[PDB]
Design a protein around this ligand. Structure first.
Ligand SMILES: CCCCCCCCCCCCCCCCCC(=O)OC[C@H](COP(=O)([O-])OCC(O)COP(=O)([O-])OC[C@@H](COC(=O)CCCCCCCCCCCCCCCCC)OC(=O)CCCCCCCCCCCCCCCCC)OC(=O)CCCCCCCCCCCCCCCCC
Ligand SMILES: CCCCCCCCCCCCCCCCCC(=O)OC[C@H](COP(=O)([O-])OCC(O)COP(=O)([O-])OC[C@@H](COC(=O)CCCCCCCCCCCCCCCCC)OC(=O)CCCCCCCCCCCCCCCCC)OC(=O)CCCCCCCCCCCCCCCCC
Ligand SMILES: CCCCCCCC/C=C\CCCCCCCC(=O)OC[C@H](COP(=O)(O)OCCN)OC(=O)CCCCCCC/C=C\CCCCCCCC
Ligand code: HEC
Ligand code: HEM
Ligand code: HEM
Ligand code: HEM
Ligand code: HEM
Ligand SMILES: Cc1cc(C)c2nc(SCc3c(C)cccc3-n3nnn(C)c3=O)sc2c1
Ligand SMILES: Cc1cc(C)c2nc(SCc3c(C)cccc3-n3nnn(C)c3=O)sc2c1
Lengths: 49, 106, 49, 79, 378, 49, 62, 142, 54
């Protein structure tokens, strides 16, 4: 059946503190998606060469 | 076709099977064949369940190679359990091409 | 026509990856050019400028 | 002529994937990476290295029978 | 309206680079095709700068090249970009051909045969440019080719007194060398567009040899970012050579001006012509020398019909991989021998390695693939 | 391998095309004798000198 | 679940994609202010008392 | 060129504008030439004006030793011994061959550290896109 | 088959110059587009000769 299809565990890959799957996606997206996207910040100011 | 030293040659065939490494990607021998116009006609003559098994084994090995990994050793294809599933369909497609060719010169 | 003698390697002060030329040893080397040679040797491509 | 909805026919396979922003940048780098390149190297070298070991033994013999003939002749200069 | 799919110009860009289906397991050996296209554009722009200040006259050819390195502003960086960018072109080209030979990419027949034509046209282009500065290797390199080019039996001596302008060596001599060298890189560009048009009919091969129509990914963004990264890593290595060792790959003897009177102590071409030069000097004849030089590039076109294996690539063939790197270690031997003088040890080693280059491709490789078929029971 | 060209009636096809192909070898004997002005076979016929 | 300081700029400017393509222009500034402090000053320090402007104070005495 | 032969025993003296760049050994060769003049070994003979130098192609050079102790006076107070003056016509004549030597090595440092910003950050952009494919899981349910 | 319609290079030539649908009442005022393309090729080849001696 299709009710036997569940997603396998992906906690080998997650951003470290978001693995606590009890708290819900409200404070754990305030400060999670940006510092390797500040690596996009320096890859432009440095792309100017 | 030797009868006494076909134990020696059974060991060379096992050594070459392990030194080639399609078994470590979970492939069978007929999965690795080069697809010319002859092999492409034998593929579309396969029954539905054997065609579906071949598409998944190829997709899984192409995914392992993208990551530079192999399977666990308990899931490697063994030498005595490799099924030559494509070989009877390919011999018939080749035998029909020789007959259209002997007809055209005579 | 048998064998050559190849020169040894001296530790010149400009033999580094970022090492400059000594500009007082250039100054004393122009005066050995213009008092010892300049009489048998030419130097067609260098000007006073 | 060959675009995405026209390539093959495929049945009964399923794919699960995560967003790039839900993943950390380096899950492992040096604990996974070092033993994986040590077995990718063990599989290589007995096919690749022995031809270049034979070029080395020909370079070393060839630049040693040139120097014995370009006038290293103390006892090969007799009356 | 998706304007990427309905505009007449944007359709062509989208089908060729954005929405193109590509295999997912493509290695970084597949990076060197776009590196070759970067090296070609670089040689064209830099060469168009040098051609406004060069003079093709055998009394002022050497002096117009020293002038740009000393007088013209940024002429020294642009000249050594051009000389070192040509070594960069030839190292990517030898990686590219060795890739297509190991993985079996020659089975794309129209793509492989346009490639063998492109290999001749870049080798002839680089020969003409090394004549233009007129030092003592541009002189004794030009005469060695054109007295070897008088051993063509019926039209040979007709063709040698055409390229010097009709005379021996004079001013109008390097106007013909310069005009060939100007024009051929723009024909190389047109042959590389047709080259990719025939590959668009099948898509790419992959390291397994097995068709991958069940595992495609779009070209953007996965190989647009992987090709930009490899190009930046190539511009780093090129500038390490221009700015920290600009004379490492050249020869010092080309800083002396050409003189039929004086004498050069040795004759050594550039490193990427040294393998062909070693095959020439192993044939005591001058018709059988120019034949075996042209037959060492033209043997690539027989690779589709010499293929006797059941599989396409060498990934699963361990005996064919020992022969592939015996062939690479034999082209290293022929590069070393080509820069040595002609005495006793380097004369038998040079001809026993010219035999091995043809024995591996023509005899030992098609027999080894049949032994492998028989050990797998086809 | 190239015994695809070996049939009992395939060599019959050479018998009906070689009368056309008997002749354009004599176009090169007459066409660049025109073009590049070869003095070898201008010695041949008394029409031309 | 106290996170680290990643999202300085995820919300305000680098979300509208405006400053994502503008940082090549708006973001062109003050690093040729900052890398003379590098390459130039490292260059004159490895070669100390060897360049012209080191020794030119002698014959520049008019 | 013709007066130059008869004034110098038939041998023509070479131009010096490219001399270290055109030798297999550079200023190591020019230094060992000027300070390597010696006497002929017992067995060799020489022409009328022709001198023995072991670091010259075929020991016989048509060039008298042109520098010795106190050949000139420097306007620095530097003692003008034989090794000091040979060291200074190797430094000048390296500048004469390569007048861009110092500008070359200073652009090479302004390249090596403005690639050290650009390269680790195109690599992180690459690793961000490809993590979708590197984490995928596959199932087969016939 | 028809190689004018299945070869990858010959398809483009056939769609652009051979099998292109064109009106039947086109005058000789419509000649001057290909005359401009002849005049451009002529100026390029002749100009590349003059540039080796200027
Ligand atoms: C310098 C002038 C070149 C200009 C550089 C421009 C930048 C080029 C570039 O981006 O990188 C390509 C270029 C080649 O790198 P690569 O070998 O293709 O990288 C590995 C690929 O993943 C390709 O994968 P691979 O298979 O070739 O790796 C070699 C080998 C194993 O390789 C290893 O020995 C360990 C892996 C370490 C990385 C391998 C790189 C060196 C090889 O891999 C395996 O054995 C696994 C394959 C199947 C066996 C089954 C085992 C399951 C996995 O890298 C360079 O920067 C050029 C430097 C000179 C290298 C080429 C010249 C010698 C030929
Ligand atoms: C097994 C080994 C591989 C088998 C080779 C077959 C495929 C390779 C191939 O295309 O050969 C090119 C061609 C040989 O094929 P072919 O001469 O066309 O054969 C005559 C066919 O019966 C004539 O039939 P067709 O189908 O070739 O007639 C259509 C023909 C005519 O269509 C066109 O050529 C288009 C017009 C282009 C000129 C546009 C105006 C000027 C600009 O199209 C082509 O010739 C395309 C090939 C030319 C590529 C370069 C295009 C120049 C730009 O090139 C060579 O002569 C040497 C390379 C191949 C030699 C390998 C054969 C063993 C010796
Ligand atoms: C003339 C001058 C030539 C200059 C080039 C000289 C370069 C030297 C080559 C040294 C690098 C060695 C590569 C290391 C990779 C290696 O050996 O690992 C084996 C590894 C295993 O990979 P797979 O087969 O995918 O896995 C099979 C499962 N067994 O094999 C490879 O990586 C194969 C790579 C294919 C070759 C690609 C580049 C070719 C290399 C040399 C080019 C030399 C030219 C040869 C002929 C060209 C003529 C113009
Ligand atoms: C009055 C003569 C005379 C003077 C002074 C002289 N030379 Fe020479 N030099 C020669 C002659 C003659 C040759 C050509 C040598 C030959 O062919 O044998 C020569 C050749 C050379 C060569 C080239 C050797 C080679 O391998 O080609 C160098 C380097 C050289 N000289 C350095 C110097 C330097 C440095 C000075 C002075 C600071 C100097 N010479 C002064 C006569 C002179
Ligand atoms: C100036 C010369 C060349 C240029 C610009 C060029 C360019 C390219 C490019 C961009 C690709 C696609 C990407 C890739 O796989 O790397 C490619 C593929 C290919 N090229 Fe070249 N190439 C050149 C010369 C050659 C030569 C000399 C050969 C062979 C003799 C050749 C044979 C091939 C083949 C067979 C492929 C397809 C390989 C595959 O998909 O596995 N090319 N080329
Ligand atoms: C595939 C492209 C090219 C290659 C491989 C190539 C190669 C070379 C080489 C090896 C030299 C000798 C330089 C030296 O060692 O000093 C040279 C010189 C020269 N080339 Fe190129 N070249 C290419 C394209 C061009 C183009 C397109 C032009 C002009 C429009 C050009 C103009 C020149 C000029 C003027 C010289 C003489 C100046 C000099 O020697 O620096 N080149 N070329
Ligand atoms: C180097 C310059 C040009 C070239 C090579 C060129 C070439 C051509 C060619 C071959 C055609 C198709 C045949 C024809 O109708 O004559 C054409 C059509 C046309 N051209 Fe040009 N042209 C050039 C300049 C211009 C200019 C300056 C204009 C207008 C400002 C223009 C506007 C048009 C138009 C509107 C048509 C279609 C006319 C119709 O079908 O009634 N072109 N051109
Ligand atoms: C649309 C194309 C072109 C046009 C309309 C054009 C027009 C002209 C004109 C009017 C002159 C003055 C000649 C005189 O009156 O004495 C001239 C001169 C010249 N052009 Fe062009 N030209 C074209 C293309 C080219 C190209 C492509 C080149 C070089 C690759 C070239 C090279 C020269 C040279 C070298 C001169 C030298 C002066 C002379 O010969 O009189 N031209 N051109
Ligand atoms: C950074 C950059 C940009 C561009 C615009 C670019 N363009 C190519 S050529 C694409 C291509 C075509 C047109 C036709 C058939 C096959 C492939 N192709 N398929 N796989 N690979 C590796 C290929 O090059 S590389 C490259 C790199
Ligand atoms: C297809 C092809 C065509 C040609 C014409 C060709 N020629 C050579 S060897 C030429 C040479 C010699 C003999 C001596 C000194 C220098 C150079 N020489 N000339 N140009 N370059 C870059 C050099 O190294 S292989 C080759 C292959």
């Amino acid at each position: 059946s299709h009710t036997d299809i569940r997603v396998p565990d992906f906690s080998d890959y997650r951003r470290a503190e978001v693995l606590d799957s009890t708290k819900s996606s409200k404070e754990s997206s305030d400060a999670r998606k940006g510092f390797s996207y500040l690596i996009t910040a320096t890859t432009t100011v440095g792309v100017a060469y | 076709a030797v009868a006494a030293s076909s134990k020696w040659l059974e060991g060379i065939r096992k050594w070459y099977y392990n030194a080639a490494g399609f078994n470590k990607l979970g492939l069978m021998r007929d999965d690795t064949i080069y697809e010319d116009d002859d092999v492409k006609e034998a593929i579309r003559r396969l029954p539905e369940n054997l065609y579906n098994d071949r598409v998944f084994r190829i997709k899984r090995a192409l995914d392992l190679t993208m990551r530079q990994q192999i399977l666990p050793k308990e899931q490697w294809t063994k030498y005595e359990e490799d099924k030559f599933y494509l070989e009877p369909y390919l011999k018939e497609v080749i035998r029909e091409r020789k007959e259209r060719e002997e007809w055209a010169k005579k | 026509t048998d064998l050559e003698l190849h020169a040894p390697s001296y530790p010149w002060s400009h033999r580094g990856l970022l090492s400059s030329l000594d500009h007082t040893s250039i100054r004393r080397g122009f005066q050995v050019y213009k008092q010892v040679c300049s009489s048998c040797h030419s130097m067609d491509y260098v000007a006073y400028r | 002529g060959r675009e995405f909805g026209h390539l093959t026919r495929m049945r009964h396979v399923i794919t699960y994937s995560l967003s790039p922003f839900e993943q950390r940048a380096f899950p492992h780098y040096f604990t996974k990476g070092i033993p994986n390149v040590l077995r990718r190297t063990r599989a290589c070298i007995l096919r690749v290295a022995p031809p270049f070991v034979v070029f080395y033994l020909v370079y070393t013999w060839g630049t040693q029978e040139f120097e014995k003939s370009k006038r290293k002749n103390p006892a090969a200069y007799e009356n | 309206t998706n304007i990427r799919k309905s505009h007449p110009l944007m359709k062509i860009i989208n089908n060729a680079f954005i929405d193109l289906p590509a295999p997912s397991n493509i290695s970084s050996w597949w990076n060197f095709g776009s590196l070759l296209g970067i090296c070609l554009i670089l040689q064209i722009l830099t060469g168009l700068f040098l051609a406004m200040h060069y003079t093709s006259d055998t009394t002022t050819a050497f002096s117009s090249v020293t002038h740009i390195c000393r007088d013209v502003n940024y002429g020294w960086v642009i000249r050594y970009l051009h000389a070192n960018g040509a070594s960069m072109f030839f190292i990517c080209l030898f990686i590219h051909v060795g890739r297509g030979l190991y993985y079996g990419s020659y089975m794309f027949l129209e793509t492989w045969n346009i490639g063998v034509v492109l290999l001749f046209t870049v080798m002839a282009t680089a020969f003409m440019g090394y004549v233009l500065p007129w030092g003592q290797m541009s002189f004794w390199g030009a005469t060695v080719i054109t007295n070897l080019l008088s051993a063509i039996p019926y039209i040979g001596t007709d063709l040698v007194e055409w390229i010097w302008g009709g005379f021996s060596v004079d001013k109008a001599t390097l106007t013909r060398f310069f005009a060939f060298h100007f024009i051929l890189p723009f024909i190389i560009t047109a042959l590389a567009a047709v080259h990719l048009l025939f590959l668009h009919e099948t898509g790419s091969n992959n390291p397994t040899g097995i068709s991958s129509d069940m595992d495609k990914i779009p070209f953007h963004p996965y190989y647009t970012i992987k090709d930009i990264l490899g190009a930046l890593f190539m511009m780093l290595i090129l500038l390490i050579l221009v700015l920290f060792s600009p004379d490492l790959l050249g020869d010092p003897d080309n800083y002396t001006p050409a003189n039929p009177l004086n004498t050069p102590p040795h004759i050594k071409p550039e490193w990427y012509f040294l393998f062909a030069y070693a095959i020439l000097r192993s044939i005591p004849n001058k018709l059988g020398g120019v034949l075996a030089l042209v037959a060492s590039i033209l043997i690539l076109i027989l690779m589709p019909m010499l293929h006797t294996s059941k599989q396409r690539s060498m990934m699963f063939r361990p005996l064919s991989q020992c022969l592939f790197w015996m062939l690479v270690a034999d082209l290293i031997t022929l590069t070393w021998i080509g820069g040595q003088p002609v005495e006793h040890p380097f004369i038998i080693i040079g001809q026993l390695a010219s035999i091995l280059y043809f024995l591996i491709i023509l005899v030992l490789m098609p027999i080894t693939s049949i032994i492998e078929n028989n050990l797998l029971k086809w | 391998m190239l015994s695809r060209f070996l049939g009992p009636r395939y060599r019959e096809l050479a018998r009906n095309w070689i009368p056309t192909a008997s002749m354009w070898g004599a176009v090169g004997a007459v066409g660049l004798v025109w073009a590049t002005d070869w003095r070898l076979i201008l010695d041949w016929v008394p029409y031309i000198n | 679940a106290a996170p680290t300081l990643t999202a300085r700029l995820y919300s305000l400017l680098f979300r509208r994609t405006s400053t994502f393509a503008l940082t090549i222009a708006v973001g062109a500034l003050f690093f040729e202010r900052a890398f003379d402090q590098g390459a130039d000053a490292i260059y004159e320090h490895i070669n100390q008392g060897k360049l012209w402007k080191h020794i030119k104070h002698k014959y520049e005495n008019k | 060129p013709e007066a130059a032969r008869a004034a110098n025993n038939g041998a023509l003296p070479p131009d010096l504008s490219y001399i270290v760049r055109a030798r297999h050994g550079g200023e190591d060769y020019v230094f060992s030439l000027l300070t390597g003049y010696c006497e002929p070994p017992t067995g060799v003979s020489l022409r009328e004006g022709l001198y023995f130098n072991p670091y010259f192609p075929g020991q016989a050079i048509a060039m008298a030793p042109p520098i010795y102790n106190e050949v000139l006076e420097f306007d620095d107070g530097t003692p003008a011994t034989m090794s000091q003056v040979a060291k200074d016509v190797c430094t000048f004549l390296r500048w004469a061959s390569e007048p861009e030597h110092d500008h070359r090595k200073r652009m090479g440092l302004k390249m090596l550290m403005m690639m050290g910003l650009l390269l680790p950050l195109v690599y992180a952009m690459k690793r961000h896109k490809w993590s979708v494919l590197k984490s995928r899981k596959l199932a087969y349910r016939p």
